[PDB]
């Protein structure tokens, strides 16, 4: 379909350049990386400090480039524990200029112990342009 081809073109043109997470109350960095955790088809891994689970809110900054124009770039993220969805989050960026690089700041508002969670949490992220699914990716989390 034209839509399927279009999703593939958007994916081809997309890269997540860097990302970080902060305690929203203190602004201290909890995590930073330059690995593109959005790449589909491989299980990514990340290690986060266990204090993140006690945060009332986390601020995320995600820097991305896109060759393609998007009308309504958005994300759906599911938190899976042993295969069970515990939480679903929605984030909207909106319009994306073709051949742009953009920083996207979002707030994530709030648990089992870190020792139970560690290695058993998968974040499933779906990237959309409006209702067109561009890609699905997965990251397994370890709490350190």
Cβ-based nearer residue to ligand NH6, 1 or 72: 72
Query: Can you give the length of the chain in residues?
Result: 144
CA 2/CA 64 separation, integer angstroms: 25
Cβ-based nearer residue to ligand NH6, 1 or 101: 101
- When binding is defined by CB under 6 A, the residue of 11, 24, 37, 39 that contacts ligand NH6 is 37
Contact string 88-107 vs ligand NH6 (x = CB under 6 A): --------------------
Q: How many CB atoms lie within 10 A of CB 34?
A: 10
Residue 2: CB minimum distance to ligand NH6, A: 26
> Does the footprint of ligand NH6 cover residue 121 (CB under 6 A)?
yes
Beta strand extents in 13-69 (DSSP E only) = 14-23, 29-33, 43-48, 57-66
CA 115/CA 139 separation, integer angstroms: 18
Stretch that binds ligand NH6, among 1-9, 50-58, 66-74, 90-98 (CB under 6 A): 50-58
> Does the footprint of ligand NH6 cover residue 116 (CB under 6 A)?
no
Whose tokens are 């699905």? That residue is 136
- When binding is defined by CB under 6 A, the residue of 11, 24, 39, 53 that contacts ligand NH6 is 53
Which residues partner with 46 through β-bridges? 141
CA 98 to chain centroid: 21
Strands 57-66 and 132-143: unpaired
> Does the footprint of ligand NH6 cover residue 52 (CB under 6 A)?
yes
Q: For residue 41, give the 3-state DSSP assignment.
A: coil
Instruction: Give the residues lining the site for ligand NH6 (CB under 6 A).
Output: 16, 19, 21, 31, 37-38, 46, 48, 52-53, 58, 60, 62, 77, 79, 86-87, 108, 111, 117, 121, 123, 125, 139, 141
């Amino acid at each position: 379909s034209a839509k399927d081809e279009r999703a593939r073109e958007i994916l081809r043109g997309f890269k997540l350049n860097w990302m970080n997470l902060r305690d929203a109350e203190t602004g201290k960095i909890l995590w930073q990386g330059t690995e593109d955790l959005s790449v589909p088809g491989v299980e990514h891994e990340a290690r986060v400090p266990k204090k993140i689970l006690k945060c009332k809110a986390v601020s995320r900054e995600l820097n991305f480039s896109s060759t393609e124009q998007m009308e309504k770039f958005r994300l759906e993220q599911k938190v899976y524990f042993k295969g069970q969805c515990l939480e679903e989050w929605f984030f909207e960026f909106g319009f994306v200029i073709p051949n742009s690089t953009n920083t996207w700041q979002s707030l994530i508002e709030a648990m089992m112990p870190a020792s139970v969670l560690t290695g058993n949490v998968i974040i499933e992220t779906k990237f959309f342009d409006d209702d067109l699914l561009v890609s699905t990716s997965r990251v397994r989390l370890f709490y350190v």
